[PDB]
């Protein structure tokens, strides 16, 4: 069957902000994930990609902001964010 599926299809990008950087102090990484991926799939994919033992994966759905511009109401995409808590010393290098 065509279309090899990759763990890297599920972890889109890291989330870099003040809250994420403060979470990195407690070995916790925030990623944007495919909106159709569950916590177990995300956990397995993170373990496969980063070679790290994962103690927890939490998820939230962040609705996209709505702004009125010319051409009317424009809508930013809805995203799913996975917050991954990692073993005591394992570390993830997101660069």
């Amino acid at each position: 069957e065509l279309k090899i599926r990759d763990p890297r299809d599920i972890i889109l990008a890291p989330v870099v902000s003040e809250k994420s950087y403060g979470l990195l102090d407690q070995n916790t990484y925030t990623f944007v994930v495919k909106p159709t991926a569950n916590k177990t799939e995300i956990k397995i994919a993170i373990e496969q990609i980063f070679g790290v033992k994962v103690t927890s994966v939490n998820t939230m759905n962040r609705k996209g902001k709505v702004r009125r511009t010319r051409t009317g109401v424009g809508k930013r995409p809805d995203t799913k964010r996975a917050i991954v808590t990692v073993a005591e010393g394992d570390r993830i290098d997101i660069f």
Binding site: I4, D6, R8, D9, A13, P14, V16, V32, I94, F95
Partner: protein, 69 residues
């Protein structure tokens, strides 16, 4: 820029290794884009076009559009 003519000379297993390598490169490019790196924003689209090329070669071998080595 990969060429479909070159990929048509490769075999199936190395073509799929190429698919996985391109997926890994796209992953790294997206992470660099998120973190403020990636001066080279054209490779971000070109790697996906390369993935499409390899999939086209693999599927034309699967569907017998071109003879499969």
């Amino acid at each position: 820029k990969l060429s479909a003519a070159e990929l048509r000379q490769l075999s199936g297993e190395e073509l799929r290794n190429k698919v996985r390598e391109l997926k890994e490169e796209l992953f790294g490019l997206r992470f660099q884009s998120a973190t403020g790196q990636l001066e080279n924003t054209a490779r971000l689209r070109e790697v996906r076009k390369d993935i499409a090329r390899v999939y086209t070669v693999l599927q034309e071998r699967n569907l017998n559009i071109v003879d499969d080595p």
